[PDB]
Amino acid sequence: PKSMQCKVILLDGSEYTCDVEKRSRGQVLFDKVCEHLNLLEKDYFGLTYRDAENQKNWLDPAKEIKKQVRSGAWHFSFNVKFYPPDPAQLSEDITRYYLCLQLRDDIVSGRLPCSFVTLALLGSYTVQSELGDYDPDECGSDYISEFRFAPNHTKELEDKVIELHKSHRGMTPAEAEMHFLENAKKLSMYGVDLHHAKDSEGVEIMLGVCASGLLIYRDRLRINRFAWPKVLKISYKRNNFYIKIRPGEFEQFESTIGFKLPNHRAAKRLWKVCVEHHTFFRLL
């Protein structure tokens, strides 16, 4: 029974290596990673791989790994797939811990924009969780943390993390992680998966996929939001992605909004992430 080596980048940046039979479905590898992580609330998470075009794809747990990675290396990342709108309702602290690690990467990467004060507050909770109570011994007037807090670090930000860290004395790691999440969950791009697209007129837009629904980021002055309930049907054809928006009370017919994606694979990927979010956040 021939087995393939799998390498998984974990949310703390470490590498997990295991073997699965070469015809294994994605669920097999995911179960091994989740067991390694002592993770029970697995429904929020998944594995990503980089395709032949170098795009992030979700590993479908129901299909063969080899029919997804195809010509590519069996190299994966462990990631949050469905960001819970209310992390306080997760049953386990260890779930909230992995969600914090993902969000720290979302922030450092610039995928999750954040004001100066929120960067410092989030950073202060991470430090409290990771190091415990503020200690002046490790912190002189010139201190710079090993922790990555932001896409661009400044001495002012490092100072503000320390000032807020001082206020968290006696906070336990679970407590600091919960505070981190109560702040992060409110950010306007929390849990938003962004896709480049063009509207029916050829104007460059971004489509965002999240728990609440679909966002079309057009102008800055113009952001259209379609709650999942308002979305009747999702479809793709060639390079195009279509949503069917319900009739408002007393209107005879649904409206169709069409988008042009860069290529057919980008359209299918957007379609699948929308279907999965629609299903997940219809049940939650």
Answer for which of 7, 155, 225, 237 binds ligand 9KS (CB under 6 A) is 225
Give the integer Cα–Cα distance in Å for 257 and 241: 8
Scanning 18-26, 52-60, 208-216, 261-269 for contacts with ligand 9KS by CB under 6 A, the matching segment is 208-216
The distance of closest approach from Cβ of residue 188 to ligand 9KS in the complex, given in angstroms and rounded to an integer, is: 7
**In this chain, which residue has its C-beta nearest to ligand 9KS?**
213
Closer residue to ligand 9KS in complex, CB, 147/217: 217
Scanning 26-34, 76-84, 95-103, 207-215 for contacts with ligand 9KS by CB under 6 A, the matching segment is 207-215
Q: Is 183 in the site for ligand 9KS (CB under 6 A)?
A: no
Q: Is 213 in the site for ligand 9KS (CB under 6 A)?
A: yes
Q: Are strands 204-209 and 193-198 parallel, antiparallel or unpaired?
A: antiparallel
Which conformational region is residue 112 in: left (phi greater than 0), alpha (psi within -120 to 50 degrees), or beta? beta
Scanning 22-30, 139-147, 209-217, 267-275 for contacts with ligand 9KS by CB under 6 A, the matching segment is 209-217
Q: Is 227 in the site for ligand 9KS (CB under 6 A)?
A: yes
CB 197 within 8 A of CB 260: yes
Closer residue to ligand 9KS in complex, CB, 36/196: 196
Closer residue to ligand 9KS in complex, CB, 27/212: 212
Give the integer Cα–Cα distance in Å for 284 and 77: 25
Closer residue to ligand 9KS in complex, CB, 225/264: 225
Total of residues contacting ligand 9KS (CB under 6 A):
7
Q: Is 234 in the site for ligand 9KS (CB under 6 A)?
A: no
Name residues contacting ligand 9KS, limited to 29-68 (CB under 6 A): none
Scanning 27-35, 85-93, 212-220, 247-255 for contacts with ligand 9KS by CB under 6 A, the matching segment is 212-220
3-state SS string for 181-235: HHHHCCCCCCCCEEEEEECCCCCEEEEEECCCEEEEECCCCCEEEEEHHHEEEEE
Answer for which of 183, 212, 239, 240 binds ligand 9KS (CB under 6 A) is 212
The distance of closest approach from Cβ of residue 223 to ligand 9KS in the complex, given in angstroms and rounded to an integer, is: 7
The distance of closest approach from Cβ of residue 215 to ligand 9KS in the complex, given in angstroms and rounded to an integer, is: 5
Answer for which of 65, 121, 122, 215 binds ligand 9KS (CB under 6 A) is 215
CB 204 within 8 A of CB 219: no
Rg (alpha carbons) of the chain, rounded to whole number: 21
Which positions touch ligand 9KS (CB under 6 A)? Answer: 210, 212-213, 215, 225-227
